[PDB]
Ligand binder design. Structure first.
Ligand SMILES: *[C@@H]1O[C@H](CO)[C@@H](O[C@@H]2O[C@H](CO)[C@@H](O)[C@H](O)[C@H]2NC(C)=O)[C@H](O)[C@H]1NC(C)=O
Ligand SMILES: *[C@@H]1O[C@H](CO)[C@@H](O)[C@H](O)[C@H]1NC(C)=O
Ligand SMILES: *[C@@H]1O[C@H](CO)[C@@H](O)[C@H](O)[C@H]1NC(C)=O
Ligand SMILES: [Zn+2]
Lengths: 596, 194
């Protein structure tokens, strides 16, 4: 127990000097993102460099302590967080080679262009361009050439860079007692504590498979309905039994199916609820939206908002010679300073993004009393679930008419409920197979089960085996289709989106049961409920102090992920889809391609 | 009449650090405890042993005033029977205290942009504080078995750290000015009254 005291004394000093450095860096970064100018960028760079150097030196120094000789788990977690800095455990030349590979690969992703086969002088980008074509157009050939182009002038250039990048990442990973650059990412899902609370990275691959196997039938029903509906538009290209072509999914990669709504409306003779004219005619401004959000949060027992929040935050576009980045973000500058940057307009979507970007500040404010290397979420996918349960609650017709935006005699029909549920499904349940497949393929390619020769034949067969999507043109071993995505070519993990979509519905069901609500779960509002707020606050007080198993048990009474709330949320949609899919084939086969 | 110098303690232009707190004695000095009021921003005024209302009739031998500046979330440590960083190494009160404390916010006077590094506090010490004493030492703290020779390094630390007060900080991080009053009755005649 002689090393425990030394570790505590070292950690106290580290905490005191990291607080100041982190605050200075955050303040500089905030000042840049509101007053874009060269000297602000220079100040931001100087502020970030000092913090990075200090962190590296402190981790190298903290390597001198043994985790086996520390018995208190609270300081042991801090030591593990500090010593885990195996991104610089490489020679200098290898590190600079990795950095230049990343920079050039991102540059090719950002700069790439495609050109019209019939209009050679017209060439388009991705953001102001091809995205609009894939989100709006209906012509088969137009989408076909856009898809094939982008693939040809992205993968052809990013293939060898990715090939040389994988081995360097594996070498980096095999220096922190990891066998690949897989479980290195799966290590965020690690817990230690009492019996029954432990969790390693090899249990994730089994839980994910069990979850997907339970999820599949609803996805099959939705896929069959979409396929049978997406034939009046292309009545010469869709096979009743086969898969769906990749260039007809309303998105460039098929990540989301939300742009297929106008072609897949159950009842197109009646619109959805949109309180935008009412807010304009009632005289609503940007400050009123945030006041309403604060009132909703305090109705459940959560605290108020700080005095500095109302004075240091940019809630509207300045509208002068001051260019800003327009993207909603909640910020934690540190030392009790919370701000929100958002361009606010009088629309429903802003009204929901407000309630999502304050459930991040209420979590941040919740764990402000914990030590420095414990002030975060629990499982990488816990901070975006607490932000999407508030938007779910504050979008219900009952909540909308309780604040004066719907008439007091408003009656909800049953067709609009089906429309809302199908629109939700096109975004939530239609992306899980994509995420699962991409993670499975990339885990396999890092492990070494897929060599370079079978690099692309495995991808396009898991596509038609799991997702149910078939390519329109054959692809040789020179293309790199996965690299034509932002997350694969910029080193971002792609597993938090699956876990967040699983956790959010468990949280919602637990809170709704705590609030004593009767009826369908999609019509649940947690307003004016102190018990639900108390339970949620009991969960949000910890951060990384305890294993995420305890954090999850503190709300749902379960130790691991579950699927039943998600399936319960989509029950009327499921029964409606089963009734509709009565004289049609539900599944798909893998022996059809629109080029044979 | 004679009044008594509480205006040079409460309205001083500069306060002391926590580990070097000032201590002032009150002489044959008729003093009133109502001038202290009318200063609205008293975020804390609570008294132990004596009642604030009937403090204008008791007479004492001498009165001690101690002034320092600490953080907002540390005021609760200035109380008998309290454990914390401030009341283990910087300022300690006995369990038999017979005075009371005054605290108020001083954000406008003590916080500046780019930081105010003129206020210090003790962070490392061997033993506890033995109520009502100060320590002003810059000796290097030794944590490991290897002796330190006046140089900071591994397991050898400098025991004084600075506050970084800025006007943007939260409510629990602005500076707070603290004045503590102590009343004692000795064998000498009681010379301070209201
Ligand atoms: C939450 O509770 C508050 C007060 O307990 C409700 O506010 C009142 O709602 C009634 C409707 O029954 C109105 O007649 C009052 O004028 C409201 N008072 C105030 C001060 O707003 C609020 O409607 C409840 N919210 C929900 C969703 O039930
Ligand atoms: C933006 O920066 C310039 C110089 O960097 C400064 O003069 C100006 O006051 C800043 N804007 C605001 C709103 O402070
Ligand atoms: C860690 O190794 C020894 C003690 O184990 C220590 O002297 C050395 O300075 C430490 N390494 C670094 C880089 O500080
Ligand atoms: Zn968010």
């Amino acid at each position: 127990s002689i090393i425990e005291e030394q570790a505590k004394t070292f950690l106290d000093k580290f905490n005191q000097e990291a607080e100041d450095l982190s605050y200075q860096s955050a303040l500089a970064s905030w000042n840049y993102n509101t007053n874009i100018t060269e000297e602000n960028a220079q100040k931001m760079n100087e502020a970030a460099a000092k913090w990075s150097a200090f962190y590296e030196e402190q981790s190298k120094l903290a390597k001198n302590y043994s985790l086996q000789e520390v018995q208190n788990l609270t300081i042991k977690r801090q030591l593990q967080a500090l010593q885990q800095s195996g991104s610089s455990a490489l020679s200098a030349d290898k590190n600079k080679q990795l950095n230049t590979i990343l920079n050039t690969m991102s540059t090719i992703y950002s700069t790439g262009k495609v050109c019209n086969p019939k209009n050679p002088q017209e060439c388009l980008l991705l953001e102001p361009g091809l995205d609009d074509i894939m989100a709006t157009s209906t012509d088969y050939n137009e989408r076909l050439w856009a898809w094939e182009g982008w693939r040809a002038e992205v993968g052809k250039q990013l293939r060898p860079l990715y090939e040389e990048y994988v081995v360097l990442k594996n070498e980096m990973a095999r220096a922190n007692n990891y066998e690949d650059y897989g479980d290195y990412w799966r290590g965020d899902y690690e817990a230690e504590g009492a019996d029954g609370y432990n969790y390693n990275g090899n249990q994730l691959i089994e839980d994910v498979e069990r979850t997907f196997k339970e999820i599949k039938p609803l996805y099959e029903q939705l896929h069959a309905y979409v396929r049978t509906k997406l034939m009046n538009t292309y009545p010469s290209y869709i096979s009743p039994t086969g898969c769906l072509p990749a260039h007809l999914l309303g998105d460039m990669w098929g990540r989301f199916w939300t742009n297929l709504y106008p072609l897949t409306v159950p009842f197109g003779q009646k619109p959805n609820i949109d309180v935008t004219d009412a807010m304009v005619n009632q005289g609503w401004n940007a400050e009123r939206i945030f006041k309403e959000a604060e009132k909703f949060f305090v109705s459940v027992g959560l605290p108020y908002m700080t005095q500095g929040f109302w004075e240091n935050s940019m809630l509207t576009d300045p509208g002068d010679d001051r260019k800003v980045v327009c993207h909603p973000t909640a910020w934690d500058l540190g030392k009790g300073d919370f701000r929100i940057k958002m361009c606010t307009k009088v629309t429903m979507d802003n009204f929901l993004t407000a309630h999502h970007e304050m459930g991040h500040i209420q979590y941040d404010m919740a764990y402000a009393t914990q030590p420095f290397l414990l002030r975060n979420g629990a499982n990488e996918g816990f901070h975006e679930a607490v932000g999407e349960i508030m938007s779910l609650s504050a979008a219900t017709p009952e909540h909308l008419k309780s604040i004066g935006l719907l008439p007091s005699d408003f009656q909800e029909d049953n067709e609009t409920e089906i429309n809302f549920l199908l629109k939700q499904a096109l975004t939530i349940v239609g992306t899980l197979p994509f995420t699962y497949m991409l993670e499975k393929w990339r885990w396999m390619v890092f492990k070494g089960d897929i060599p370079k020769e079978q690099w692309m034949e495995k991808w396009w067969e898991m596509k038609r085996e799991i997702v149910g999507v078939v390519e329109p043109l054959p692809h040789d071993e020179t293309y790199c289709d996965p690299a034509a995505l932002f997350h694969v070519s910029n080193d971002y993990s792609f597993i938090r989106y699956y876990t967040r979509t699983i956790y959010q519905f468990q949280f919602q069901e637990a809170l709704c049961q705590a609030a004593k609500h009767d009826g369908p779960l999609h019509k649940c509002d947690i307003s004016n409920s102190t018990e639900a707020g108390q339970k949620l606050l009991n969960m949000l007080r910890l951060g990384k102090s305890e294993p995420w198993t305890l954090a999850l048990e503190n709300v749902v009474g379960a130790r691991n992920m579950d699927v039943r709330p998600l399936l319960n949320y989509f029950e009327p949609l499921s029964v409606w889809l089963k009734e509709q899919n009565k004289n049609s084939f539900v599944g798909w086969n893998t022996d059809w391609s629109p080029y044979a | 009449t004679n009044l008594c110098p509480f205006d040079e303690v409460f309205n001083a232009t500069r306060f002391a650090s926590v580990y070097a707190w000032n201590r002032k004695r009150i002489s044959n000095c008729v003093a009133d405890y109502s001038v202290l009021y009318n200063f609205a921003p008293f975020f804390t005024f609570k008294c132990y042993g004596v009642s604030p209302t009937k403090l204008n009739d008791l007479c004492f031998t001498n009165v001690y005033a101690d002034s320092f500046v600490i953080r907002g979330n540390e005021v609760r440590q200035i109380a008998p029977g309290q454990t914390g960083n401030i009341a283990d190494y910087n300022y300690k009160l006995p369990d038999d205290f017979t005075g009371c404390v005054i605290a108020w916010n001083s954000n406008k006077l003590d916080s500046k942009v780019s930081g105010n590094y003129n206020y210090l506090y003790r962070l490392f010490r061997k033993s506890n504080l033995k109520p009502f004493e100060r320590d002003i030492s810059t000796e290097i703290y030794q944590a490991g078995n290897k002796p330190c020779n006046g140089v900071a390094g591994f397991n050898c630390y400098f025991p004084l750290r600075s506050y970084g007060f800025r006007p943007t900080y939260g409510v629990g991080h602005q500076p707070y000015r603290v004045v503590v009053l102590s009343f004692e009755l000795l064998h000498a005649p009681a010379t301070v009254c209201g």
